Write an enzyme that holds these catalytic residues in place. Structure first.
Site, PDB file in Angstrom:
ATOM      1  N   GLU A  35       2.713  -8.960  22.832  1.00 52.69           N
ATOM      2  CA  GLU A  35       3.907  -8.100  22.624  1.00 52.69           C
ATOM      3  C   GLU A  35       4.033  -6.513  23.450  1.00 52.69           C
ATOM      4  O   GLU A  35       5.039  -6.644  23.656  1.00 52.69           O
ATOM      5  CB  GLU A  35       3.922  -7.851  20.959  1.00 52.69           C
ATOM      6  CG  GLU A  35       3.846  -8.983  20.143  1.00 52.69           C
ATOM      7  CD  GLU A  35       5.552  -9.746  19.902  1.00 52.69           C
ATOM      8  OE1 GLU A  35       6.062  -9.210  20.489  1.00 52.69           O
ATOM      9  OE2 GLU A  35       5.481 -10.772  19.908  1.00 52.69           O
ATOM     10  N   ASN A  46      16.785  -7.034  23.363  1.00 56.43           N
ATOM     11  CA  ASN A  46      17.256  -8.794  23.116  1.00 56.43           C
ATOM     12  C   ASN A  46      18.696  -8.677  23.524  1.00 56.43           C
ATOM     13  O   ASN A  46      19.399  -8.081  23.103  1.00 56.43           O
ATOM     14  CB  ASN A  46      16.895  -8.683  21.965  1.00 56.43           C
ATOM     15  CG  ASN A  46      15.872  -8.511  20.837  1.00 56.43           C
ATOM     16  OD1 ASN A  46      15.284  -8.111  19.750  1.00 56.43           O
ATOM     17  ND2 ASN A  46      14.749  -9.255  22.094  1.00 56.43           N
ATOM     18  N   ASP A  48      20.619 -10.002  21.862  1.00 60.20           N
ATOM     19  CA  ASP A  48      22.006 -10.103  20.639  1.00 60.20           C
ATOM     20  C   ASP A  48      21.963  -8.381  19.873  1.00 60.20           C
ATOM     21  O   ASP A  48      22.666  -8.444  19.303  1.00 60.20           O
ATOM     22  CB  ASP A  48      20.855 -10.748  19.386  1.00 60.20           C
ATOM     23  CG  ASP A  48      20.077 -10.578  18.049  1.00 60.20           C
ATOM     24  OD1 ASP A  48      19.682  -9.149  19.154  1.00 60.20           O
ATOM     25  OD2 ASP A  48      19.481 -10.176  17.472  1.00 60.20           O
ATOM     26  N   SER A  50      19.519  -6.479  19.112  1.00 60.42           N
ATOM     27  CA  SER A  50      18.964  -5.591  18.786  1.00 60.42           C
ATOM     28  C   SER A  50      17.400  -5.478  19.452  1.00 60.42           C
ATOM     29  O   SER A  50      17.898  -5.596  20.720  1.00 60.42           O
ATOM     30  CB  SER A  50      17.747  -6.353  17.398  1.00 60.42           C
ATOM     31  OG  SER A  50      17.494  -7.293  18.109  1.00 60.42           O
ATOM     32  N   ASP A  52      13.478  -4.597  19.907  1.00 59.37           N
ATOM     33  CA  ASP A  52      11.777  -4.800  19.643  1.00 59.37           C
ATOM     34  C   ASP A  52      11.000  -3.784  19.613  1.00 59.37           C
ATOM     35  O   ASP A  52      11.088  -2.348  20.832  1.00 59.37           O
ATOM     36  CB  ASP A  52      10.844  -5.281  20.070  1.00 59.37           C
ATOM     37  CG  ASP A  52      11.748  -6.882  20.041  1.00 59.37           C
ATOM     38  OD1 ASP A  52      12.315  -7.327  18.751  1.00 59.37           O
ATOM     39  OD2 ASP A  52      11.458  -7.979  21.208  1.00 59.37           O
ATOM     40  N   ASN A  59      11.127  -5.874  14.827  1.00 58.09           N
ATOM     41  CA  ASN A  59      12.529  -5.982  15.352  1.00 58.09           C
ATOM     42  C   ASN A  59      13.674  -5.442  14.697  1.00 58.09           C
ATOM     43  O   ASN A  59      13.570  -5.028  13.297  1.00 58.09           O
ATOM     44  CB  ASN A  59      12.908  -7.555  15.221  1.00 58.09           C
ATOM     45  CG  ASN A  59      14.482  -7.750  16.420  1.00 58.09           C
ATOM     46  OD1 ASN A  59      15.746  -7.593  15.517  1.00 58.09           O
ATOM     47  ND2 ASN A  59      14.837  -7.771  17.712  1.00 58.09           N
TER      48      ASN A  59
HETATM   49 CL   LIG Z   1      11.835 -10.414  12.747  1.00 60.08          CL
END
Ligand SMILES: [Cl-]
Ligand SMILES: [Cl-]
Ligand SMILES: [Cl-]
Ligand SMILES: [Cl-]
Ligand SMILES: [Cl-]
Ligand SMILES: [Cl-]
Ligand SMILES: [Cl-]
Ligand SMILES: [Cl-]
Ligand SMILES: [Cl-]
Ligand SMILES: [Cl-]
Ligand SMILES: [Cl-]
Ligand SMILES: [Cl-]
Ligand SMILES: [Cl-]
Ligand SMILES: [Cl-]
Ligand SMILES: [Cl-]
Ligand SMILES: [Cl-]
Ligand SMILES: [Cl-]
Ligand code: NA
Length: 129
Positions: A35, A46, A48, A50, A52, A59
């Protein structure tokens, strides 16, 4: 903060993640490796909209507030910036909620794709724990 491998294992164990929901410590270290490469300051946007955050790339769609993810929730009740701290407490406590949400560590797609079904104990091998 960029953790060492055994350093992170120890911090995760200190915070009760070892064997949490049945997931041995090496699972958690493996997930963090892929990660964030053990970097608490990791962020990634992301498609979308969002983002992380942190060592476990938690997220903003569901888990933390960043003020810039329309329609999102904040189920860990934290600013997303808390997930970037050198102190991993907020990331660990939020990860405990995530992994309890029904799909276990499959919530982390990188865990499913890179850690699940592998010798995850290698990630803690040799560490004084
Ligand atoms: Cl998630
Ligand atoms: Cl280390
Ligand atoms: Cl490593
Ligand atoms: Cl303490
Ligand atoms: Cl364990
Ligand atoms: Cl393990
Ligand atoms: Cl983090
Ligand atoms: Cl909020
Ligand atoms: Cl805000
Ligand atoms: Cl938001
Ligand atoms: Cl922005
Ligand atoms: Cl919420
Ligand atoms: Cl906030
Ligand atoms: Cl810590
Ligand atoms: Cl917290
Ligand atoms: Cl499970
Ligand atoms: Cl397995
Ligand atoms: Na959010």
């Amino acid at each position: 903060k960029v953790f060492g491998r055994c350093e992170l294992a120890a911090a995760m164990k200190r915070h009760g993640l070892d064997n949490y929901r049945g997931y041995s410590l090496g699972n958690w270290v493996c997930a963090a490796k892929f990660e964030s490469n053990f970097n608490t300051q990791a962020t990634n946007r992301n498609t979308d909209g969002s983002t992380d955050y942190g060592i476990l790339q938690i997220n903003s769609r569901w888990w933390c507030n960043d003020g810039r993810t329309p329609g999102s929730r904040n189920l860990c009740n934290i600013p997303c910036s808390a997930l970037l701290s050198s102190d991993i407490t907020a990331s660990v406590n939020c990860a405990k909620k995530i992994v309890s949400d029904g799909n276990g560590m499959n919530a982390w797609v990188a865990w499913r794709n890179r850690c699940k079904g592998t010798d995850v104990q290698a990630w803690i091998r040799g560490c004084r724990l």
